Write a protein that binds this ligand. Structure first.
Ligand SMILES: *[C@@H]1O[C@H](CO[C@@H]2O[C@@H](C)[C@@H](O)[C@@H](O)[C@@H]2O)[C@@H](O[C@@H]2O[C@H](CO)[C@@H](O[C@@H]3O[C@H](CO[C@H]4O[C@H](CO)[C@@H](O)[C@H](O)[C@@H]4O)[C@@H](O)[C@H](O[C@H]4O[C@H](CO)[C@@H](O)[C@H](O)[C@@H]4O)[C@@H]3O)[C@H](O)[C@H]2NC(C)=O)[C@H](O)[C@H]1NC(C)=O
Ligand SMILES: *[C@@H]1O[C@H](CO)[C@@H](O[C@@H]2O[C@H](CO)[C@@H](O[C@@H]3O[C@H](CO[C@H]4O[C@H](CO)[C@@H](O)[C@H](O[C@H]5O[C@H](CO)[C@@H](O)[C@H](O)[C@@H]5O)[C@@H]4O)[C@@H](O)[C@H](O)[C@@H]3O)[C@H](O)[C@H]2NC(C)=O)[C@H](O)[C@H]1NC(C)=O
Ligand SMILES: *[C@@H]1O[C@H](CO)[C@@H](O[C@@H]2O[C@H](CO)[C@@H](O)[C@H](O)[C@H]2NC(C)=O)[C@H](O)[C@H]1NC(C)=O
Ligand SMILES: [Cl-]
Ligand SMILES: [Cl-]
Length: 369
């Protein structure tokens, strides 16, 4: 079920609003191992539940139990040590929650593969940029007939957190993530740039990237880890763009990157080895937005999953003269851009240092895809 462009959905309320996203300060001055301990006090019980769901469903489809045995006993050794800070951060999470490290690593692997998204950057007539996104998730292990949801997708909602990463008590970047995950998929560096990651599918894909890694070719970056390293350590739109366009990746991806002034917005369509396309704002020629879902801009959607066309229609209807968090939230609340897989909606304003995220629901009748 789809619908006409929504209006009057902001500030959030009603049946598509699950609730607010809590803020946590992550202190980069702490040793990596300790950075997540305070968050785990609050969200550790929920992380234990989501890994329980994954384990139990895998052990249902593979009743020998041998896959989860490999996850728990061998997966860390197959991949080898991660570069810092990620190894120690994940070990800290595993140790405080008493979850096997291989399951934390597996959780961190989920985000290289099973997300869907709608990401939008807009530029108004004053040159002001907004960057918004829906974060969708579907691993499709468990269906709950009693409320028409996917088990793991729903369990991500209480794991969702807004994070203020600080060094010397000063914000470096802000992000929305899931407790237990140490990469980043959504965030901004105030006054500098904003970044969202959308999954991309291809036959030279993440499954092959993992195989190459296991077989000893480790020159590549994990997509959630390069995103985190850019947010944490890059200092400008152009620097971020260069890193994201050129770094070798474990999996294909779309990077949606906004800056801090007119014209600074692009979609970088990535193969593992390089950029297939960089599509940038061109306000002088009437190109005042970019919209990216999970298919290549020059190709047709997957017939049964076209969120790009409705997002673009609602944007064109809104026009460049009525761009704000409120009107962009309206778009991200319109089915199928909002769908049963939508975990959260995030809204970013780099130059005004405004960052919001909201947990979502999509009441029946709603598309599951
Ligand atoms: C659709 O159903 C999902 C599954 O729920 C089951 O099926 C439905 C149909 C009912 O029969 C229900 O009774 C079944 O259990 C449902 O998923 C549930 O979502 C909630 C809300 O996110 C989760 O709540 C979190 O619970 C953990 C503790 O969970 C344990 O204890 C509770 C209380 O006894 C049990 O109900 C659980 O089964 C577990 O045994 C908390 O740690 C966690 O707290 C943290 O997050 C909240 C924010 O939500 C903060 O306020 C806190 O401070 C903490 O930071 C949550 O309270 C629940 O775990 C989850 N269940 C499962 C099994 O995944 C889903 O939301 C439904 N979706 C829709 C659209 O209706
Ligand atoms: C962004 O860039 C920075 C700068 O390159 C990256 O920071 C480095 O990260 C690696 C991996 O985690 C660290 O390497 C470890 O260092 C351990 C020793 O750490 C102590 O001694 C260091 C001197 O050798 C010292 O620099 C370090 O202080 C740093 O960390 C403290 C704890 O967080 C913090 O309070 C300090 O202010 C300072 O930031 C420690 O006191 C060693 O045991 C390990 O084997 C490993 O080698 C580096 O220490 C980090 N360097 C700095 C200057 O922070 C960072 O990871 C990048 N971020 C991303 C996401 O990619
Ligand atoms: C947008 O970002 C750019 C790039 O970081 C900013 O320009 C830099 O500003 C710093 C000061 O923090 C200077 O040290 C650099 O020399 C500047 N670089 C360039 C290429 O000019 C710019 O100030 C930001 N603009 C806004 C409006 O925030
Ligand atoms: Cl699921
Ligand atoms: Cl919730």
């Amino acid at each position: 079920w789809t619908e006409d462009c929504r209006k009057s959905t902001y500030p959030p309320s009603g049946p598509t609003y699950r609730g607010p996203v809590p803020w946590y300060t992550i202190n980069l001055d702490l040793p990596p191992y300790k950075r997540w301990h305070e968050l785990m006090v609050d969200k550790g019980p929920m992380l234990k539940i989501i890994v329980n769901s994954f384990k139990n469903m895998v052990n249902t489809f593979v009743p020998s139990g041998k896959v989860m045995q490999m996850v728990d006993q061998k997966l860390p050794d197959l991949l080898g040590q991660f570069s810092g800070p990620y190894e120690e951060e994940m070990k800290g999470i595993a140790d405080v929650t008493e979850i096997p490290l291989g399951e934390i690593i597996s959780f961190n692997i989920f985000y290289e593969l099973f997300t869907m998204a709608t990401s939008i950057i807009t530029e108004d007539k004053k040159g002001h940029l907004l960057h918004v996104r829906n974060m969708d998730f579907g691993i499709f292990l468990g269906w709950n007939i009693n409320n028409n949801t996917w088990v793991i997708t729903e369990e991500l909602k209480p794991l969702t957190v807004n994070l203020d990463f600080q060094r010397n008590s000063k914000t470096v970047f802000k992000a929305t993530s899931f407790a237990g995950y140490v990469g980043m998929l959504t965030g901004f560096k105030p006054g500098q740039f904003s970044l969202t990651l959308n999954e991309r599918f291809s036959m030279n894909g993440g499954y092959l990237g993992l195989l190459e890694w296991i077989l000893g070719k480790k020159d590549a970056s994990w997509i959630g880890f390069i995103t985190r390293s850019v947010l944490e350590n890059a200092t400008s739109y152009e620097e971020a763009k260069n890193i994201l366009a050129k770094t070798k990746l474990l999996a294909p991806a779309y990077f949606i990157l906004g800056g801090n002034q007119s014209g600074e917005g692009c979609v970088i369509t990535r193969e593992r080895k390089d950029s297939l396309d960089i599509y940038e704002l061109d306000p002088k020629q009437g190109r005042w937005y970019v919209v990216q879902t999970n298919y290549d801009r020059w190709k047709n959607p997957l017939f049964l999953d076209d969120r790009r066309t409705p997002a673009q229609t609602c944007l064109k209807r809104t026009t460049q003269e009525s761009l704000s968090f409120a009107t962009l939230y309206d778009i991200l609340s319109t089915k199928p851009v909002l769908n049963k897989l939508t975990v959260f909606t995030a809204l970013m304003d780099v130059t005004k240092n405004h960052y919001e995220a909201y947990l979502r629901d999509c009441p029946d009748p709603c598309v599951g895809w």
